[PDB]
Design a protein around this ligand. Structure first.
Ligand SMILES: Nc1ncnc2c1ncn2[C@@H]1O[C@H](COP(=O)(O)OP(=O)(O)OP(=O)(O)O)[C@@H](O)[C@H]1O
Ligand SMILES: [Mg+2]
Lengths: 376, 310
């Protein structure tokens, strides 16, 4: 339970141990018990993350020897503990700067996600409701196209490392596996029917969008073909601890998660790996079970990362800014093709504000104002 | 000899599932003015249909089989599907129009489209805007239902919807409804957080999301003063539906479902009714205006301009 940057720096007791990493991400709700911490505390069987405990992103890690598994947790604006801080600050310390603020945060979390998609064997996304946000079909689509553009800059670093042959080629130990966790939230055995339904949905969606293919190399992640990859956490009295107490008071006066994850961790600890290819002519997927030091050797070099700035400054608020700019521009014509002078000035200004507007109206407005003031 | 026109027992349709106008409602509209319209926006299982019914012509003691806006069935949940397609129409005795809609960015709709111009994903993402704009144009109040708090994607979708609408401009009111709330959500500490986040997230939206529908003055928080909040946005919470010392019930930490539903209904029927266009309309001219608005939204330009960018 320590930050990532505060760990890579500094092992001998377990400097050599075959392990499996597990990345955790997704959205959360404004509550006291995050849907991520409880997960770890539930698998390990111990209270790892205790109760009552510029940038708005973060990463955390925790290694378990009793199981030989490393856990990595991501945190960004998608959550609420961070979004609250962002808004709280923004409240104390313009429709042109805030847009850039949110855009920057989005870019930051995007690269922080690419990181996990490169140094992880298994990774899962959590959600507070059964229905899954279809918008993901786009995020992933806009993520692969990025790693490729910046793939050389990565392999050119771990190059002088013990990563291996395939690892040094794809900058990944093996095509990661994706898992889904959904919270019931009072809805509704039928659970199995719902699980299979969601699986079929996700499969068809990611397939038509081409986020998934027959080859397990070009893809940035893959799903199973015979096993289950969708878990639904039912209700539980643990949440809202106070409530639980009250319940107890009223008395003094009168498969499984771990089993759902081990079926996937065993295939890696045993060196077998994952083989997902149904193209009628499947191909073999690389694999590598590294050690602690052998893993940090590359994790540190990747975390310390130069052209990523220019590579990410092109990749969604981009479409919004584009639409706003195009609108203001196309409208500038009617603003200049209309015109003491205050009369015509205000007239053209009103015609412009009524013809189109967006997130960059200040610039296109000051421009027309200056032009008018200069044309007389 | 001054009887009324006719009473409706079930809702009707206004837009076919394939986005096609349906002229089968004039039979219930009059030449009267000063009408009020209401709309809704939400995801798959937020509880839109179950809300409008209880707000227009239904009570919690009734059964889901008598709702004027059909709800979801057990056989529909275990399969991850929807039950509301297109747009519905209903009008009560008080002469108040209610409009139900289909979820936005629904996976079931896309799944169905699979078995049937570039990618269907963009098409489904467009329909949502095509509907949101029309609602923001022909409605006085627009309710937003949610299952959990701070999705962060809805606030972006809304802002992007008010930039592709048809066209001293009109902006309707907005209500933030939180369905399936719990005890933890009925705390002042979290209440101020909610209001704070909503205010800092919709500061440049141009929509009327504040200065109305104050649940603080409706007896939901008896001993709480308005000074506790810096800016009370129009937000409402709806919870889950349901010798002497031994029979005492448990501590839930919030008011009953009936009470909140009644208060919300009373506050919704009292919303403003300003003019939409540059003329005073009746219950018929509005219908024609809306039809023209739809026909325009379809053959629009801004929507195509946004579609090409994807
Ligand atoms: N407050 C609530 N308490 C308990 N159950 C609720 C509550 N609100 C909604 N539900 C249940 O959840 C479902 C809500 O879906 P409903 O049919 O009301 O509309 P919807 O799902 O928003 O619309 P659509 O699915 O067509 O997009 C129903 O099965 C209803 O019984
Ligand atoms: Mg419905």
């Amino acid at each position: 339970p320590v930050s990532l940057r505060d760990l890579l720096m500094g092992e001998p007791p377990w400097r050599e141990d075959e392990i499996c990493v597990v990345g955790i991400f997704g959205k959360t709700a404004l509550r006291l018990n995050s849907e991520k911490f409880s997960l770890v505390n539930t698998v390990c069987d111990r209270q790892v993350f205790p109760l009552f405990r510029q940038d708005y992103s973060l990463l955390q890690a925790y290694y378990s020897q009793e199981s030989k598994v490393l856990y990595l947790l991501l945190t960004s604006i998608c959550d609420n503990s961070q979004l609250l801080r962002a808004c709280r600050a923004l409240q104390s310390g313009p429709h042109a700067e805030a847009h850039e603020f949110w855009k920057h945060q989005e870019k930051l979390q995007c690269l922080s996600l690419l990181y996990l998609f490169s140094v992880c064997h298994i990774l899962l996304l959590v959600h507070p409701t059964c229905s899954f946000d279809i918008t993901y079909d786009r995020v992933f689509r806009a993520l692969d196209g990025l790693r490729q553009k910046v793939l050389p800059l990565l392999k050119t670093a771990i190059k002088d490392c013990p990563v291996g042959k395939d690892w040094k080629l794809n900058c990944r130990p093996c095509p990661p596996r994706l898992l889904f966790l959904f919270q019931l939230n009072g809805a509704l055995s039928p659970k199995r029917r719902l699980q299979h339904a969601l699986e079929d949905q996700i499969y068809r969606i990611f397939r038509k969008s081409r986020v998934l293919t027959n080859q397990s190399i070009n893809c940035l992640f893959t799903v199973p073909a015979n096993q289950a990859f969708v878990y639904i956490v039912p209700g539980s009295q643990e949440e809202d601890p106070v409530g639980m107490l009250l319940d107890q008071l009223r008395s003094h006066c009168t498969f499984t998660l771990r089993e759902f994850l081990w079926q996937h961790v065993e295939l890696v600890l045993s060196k077998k790996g994952f083989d997902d290819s149904v193209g009628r002519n499947p191909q073999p997927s690389h694999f590598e079970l590294p050690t602690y030091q052998k893993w940090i050797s590359a994790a540190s070099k990747l975390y310390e990362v130069s052209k990523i700035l220019s590579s990410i400054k092109v990749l969604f608020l981009d479409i919004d800014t584009k639409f706003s700019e195009n609108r203001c521009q196309k409208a500038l014509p009617m603003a200049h093709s209309a015109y003491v002078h205050k009369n015509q000035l205000a007239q053209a200004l009103r015609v412009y504000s009524q013809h189109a507007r967006g997130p960059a109206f200040h610039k296109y407005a000051m421009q027309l104002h200056e032009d008018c003031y200069k044309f007389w | 000899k001054l009887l009324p026109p006719e009473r409706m027992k079930h809702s009707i349709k206004l837009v076919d599932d394939q986005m096609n106008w349906c002229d089968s409602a004039i039979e219930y509209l009059l030449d009267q003015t000063d009408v009020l319209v209401v709309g809704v926006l939400g995801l798959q299982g937020t509880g839109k249909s179950m809300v409008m019914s209880l707000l227009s012509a239904n009570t919690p003691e009734e059964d889901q089989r008598t709702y004027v806006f059909r709800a979801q069935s057990a056989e529909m949940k275990e399969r991850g599907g929807n039950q509301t397609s297109g747009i519905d129409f209903f009008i009560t005795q008080e002469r108040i129009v209610f409009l139900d809609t289909q979820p936005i960015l629904s996976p079931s709709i896309l799944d169905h489209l699979i078995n049937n111009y570039n990618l269907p994903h963009t098409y489904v993402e467009m329909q949502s805007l095509q509907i949101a704009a029309f609602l923001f144009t022909v409605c006085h109040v627009v309710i937003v239902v949610q299952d959990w708090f701070t999705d962060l994607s809805l606030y972006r979708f809304l802002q992007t919807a008010e930039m592709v609408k048809p066209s001293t401009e009109y902006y309707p009111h907005l209500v933030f409804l939180q369905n399936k709330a719990r005890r933890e959500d009925f705390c002042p500490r979290k209440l101020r957080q909610m209001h704070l986040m909503i205010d800092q997230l919709m500061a440049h939206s141009h929509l009327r999301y504040k200065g109305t529908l104050s649940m603080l003055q409706c007896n939901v928080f008896p001993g709480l003063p308005p000074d506790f909040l810096d800016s009370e946005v129009n937000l409402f919470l709806v919870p889950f539906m349901d010798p002497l010392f031994s029979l005492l019930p448990g501590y839930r930490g919030h008011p009953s479902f009936q009470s909140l539903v009644s208060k919300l209904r009373s506050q919704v029927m009292s919303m403003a009714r300003p003019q939409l266009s540059h003329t005073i309309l009746t219950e018929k001219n509005w219908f024609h205006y809306a039809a023209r608005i739809w026909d325009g939204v379809r053959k629009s330009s801004a929507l195509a301009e946004y579609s090409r960018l994807l």
